C-alpha cells in the first residue's frame, strides 16, 4: 500500500482552516463501516502523536478543531481554526495490511506576521582559545518567516566556508524561529584578523543588520 499526501507543504494564517488529503493505492474500508486509516502530528524533535483513528475518530485530548473524513482510498484531515500549536508534520497511516505504510508527511507552518530577528554576537571565549580553536557565534531571535541570511565577514571579507547553522522549530506559542550561526576558525587565523561580523538579511529588516567586534577589544 502506497500513501500519497497532498499538499506536502502548507502555510496557514492563524485562525484559518486547513485540509490535508491522503490517497491509498487500495481500499482501507472495513466491516464496522470505519476505515483502517490514522492521522498523526509530529513536532520537530518530538514523537508522533495520534489525532485520528478509524478514519474519523478523534484521539485522546485532541481538540474538536481536528476532523477526519473520507472512505476507501481518498481521505481528508480538517483543521477548523489553525492555532500556533498545530505547527508540525502531519502523517496519514494505513493499518489495513502489512507493511503498515505512512504518507510522505505534510509540514504545516503557521503564516504569522513578519517579525525581524534580534541579533547577538559572541566572540570566542578564552577557554576555547586555549584549545587552539576560535568560534564566533551569531544568534538570531524570534523572526518570521524562516528565511534569514547570515553572512560572516572577517576584515570585511565575506566567508563562503567555516560556518554552520541550525534553526529551532517554529515556536508553539509565538510561531517565530531562532537561529544559531557559528563561524569556527583556527586560533592562528583568528589572531591574524581584526574585524568579525555577522550580517543578517531578513524580510523584516529594511537594511541588513551587522553585529561586529574587533578582536581583543571586547
Amino acid at each position: 500500500i502506497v500513501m500519497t499526501q497532498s499538499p506536502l507543504s502548507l502555510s496557514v494564517t492563524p485562525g484559518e482552516p486547513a485540509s490535508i488529503s491522503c490517497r491509498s493505492s487500495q481500499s482501507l474500508l472495513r466491516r464496522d463501516g470505519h476505515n483502517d486509516l490514522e492521522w498523526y502530528l509530529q513536532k520537530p524533535g518530538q514523537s508522533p502523536q495520534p489525532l485520528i483513528y478509524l478514519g474519523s475518530t478523534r484521539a485522546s485530548g485532541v481538540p474538536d478543531r481536528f476532523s477526519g473524513s473520507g472512505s476507501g482510498t481518498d481521505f481528508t484531515l480538517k483543521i477548523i481554526r489553525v492555532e500556533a500549536e498545530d505547527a508540525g508534520t502531519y502523517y496519514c497511516m494505513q493499518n489495513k495490511q502489512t507493511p503498515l505504510t505512512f504518507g510522505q508527511g505534510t509540514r504545516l507552518e503557521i503564516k504569522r506576521t513578519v517579525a525581524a530577528p534580534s541579533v547577538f554576537i559572541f566572540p570566542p571565549s578564552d577557554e576555547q582559545l586555549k584549545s587552539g580553536t576560535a568560534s564566533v557565534v551569531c544568534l538570531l531571535n524570534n523572526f518570521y518567516p524562516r528565511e534569514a541570511k547570515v553572512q560572516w565577514k572577517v576584515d570585511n571579507a565575506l566567508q563562503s566556508g567555516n560556518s554552520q547553522e541550525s534553526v529551532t522549530e517554529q515556536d508553539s506559542k509565538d510561531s517565530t524561529y531562532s537561529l544559531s550561526s557559528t563561524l569556527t576558525l583556527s586560533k592562528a587565523d583568528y589572531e591574524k584578523h581584526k574585524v568579525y561580523a555577522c550580517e543578517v538579511t531578513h524580510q523584516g529588516l529594511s537594511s541588513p543588520v551587522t553585529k561586529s567586534f574587533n578582536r581583543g577589544e571586547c
Binding site: 514523537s47 485522546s60 502523517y91 507493511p99 577557554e127 567555516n162 553585529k211
Partner: protein, 213 residues
C-alpha cells in the same frame, strides 16, 4: 507513557537491542510496533510483535529482512527490537508504538568513538537588551548528535532558554550547537555566575560557569 532505551553508537556489523518498557499498562495485551525515522526524513515501519493470544506472530519489512528480531518479555513489561549486522543506512530514530508512541531512541552506525562536547561560556560583545541579560554556552564538537540536552541554573518568568539543533561540522563527524539564556538583569547581577548543564550521550554531564555581564 512508553519508556525507550538501548539505543546509541554501534559499530558497523555490530548489534543493538532496543528496549520499549510500558508504564501504567501491560504490554502483554498489546501488539507492539517499531517505526524508524532518519534525520529530517519521514516514517518507515520496521515490524511488529503480535499480542500473546495470536501465538506472538512477527510480520517484518523487506528493507532490513533477516537482520531484525522483535521480541517481548512480559515478565519485564518490555518489548524489544534486536538489530544485527548494522549498516550506515540503519542510522535513524526508532520509536515503539502500542494507543501510544515511545519517546524514541537514536541509533548511529559508526566506527567512530563518542566525542564529548567542548562546552564554553559565551559573553556578549554586542548590545545587552533592554532590562535583560543574554548569555550563551557554545557546545562544540560532539558525536553522536543526540541525545544532547542543555539546562540552566536559572528559570521562571522572564527567563527563556534557546536550544538549537546540533549541526554537522565542516569535516569529520562532529556536531556543534549552542544554548542561549535570556533573563531579567535583576536575575543575573554583576559578580553573579550562572551554569549551563550539558548532558550528552552516556558520558558524564558538564556544568559550565557563565559569568553575568
Amino acid at each position: 507513557q512508553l519508556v525507550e532505551s538501548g539505543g546509541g553508537l554501534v559499530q558497523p556489523g555490530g548489534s543493538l537491542k532496543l528496549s520499549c518498557a510500558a508504564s501504567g499498562f501491560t504490554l502483554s495485551g498489546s501488539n507492539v510496533h517499531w517505526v524508524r525515522q532518519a534525520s529530517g526524513k519521514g516514517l518507515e515501519w520496521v515490524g511488529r510483535i503480535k499480542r500473546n493470544a495470536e501465538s506472538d506472530a512477527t510480520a517484518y519489512a523487506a528493507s532490513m529482512r533477516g537482520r531484525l528480531t522483535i521480541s517481548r518479555d512480559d515478565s519485564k513489561n518490555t518489548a524489544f527490537l534486536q538489530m544485527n549486522s548494522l549498516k550506515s543506512d540503519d542510522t535513524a530514530m526508532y520509536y515503539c508504538v502500542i494507543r501510544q508512541w515511545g519517546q524514541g531512541t537514536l541509533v548511529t552506525v559508526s566506527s567512530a568513538s563518542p566525542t564529548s562536547p567542548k562546552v564554553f561560556p559565551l559573553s556578549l560583545c554586542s548590545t545587552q537588551p533592554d532590562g535583560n541579560v543574554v548569555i550563551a554556552c557554545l557546545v562544540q564538537g560532539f558525536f553522536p548528535q543526540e541525545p544532547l540536552s542543555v539546562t540552566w541554573s536559572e528559570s521562571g518568568q522572564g527567563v527563556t532558554a534557546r536550544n538549537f539543533p546540533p549541526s554537522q561540522d565542516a569535516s569529520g563527524d562532529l556536531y556543534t550547537t549552542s544554548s542561549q539564556l535570556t533573563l531579567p538583569a535583576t536575575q543575573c547581577l554583576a559578580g553573579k555566575s550562572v551554569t549551563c548543564h550539558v548532558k550528552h550521550y552516556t558520558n558524564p554531564s558538564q556544568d559550565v560557569t557563565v559569568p553575568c555581564p
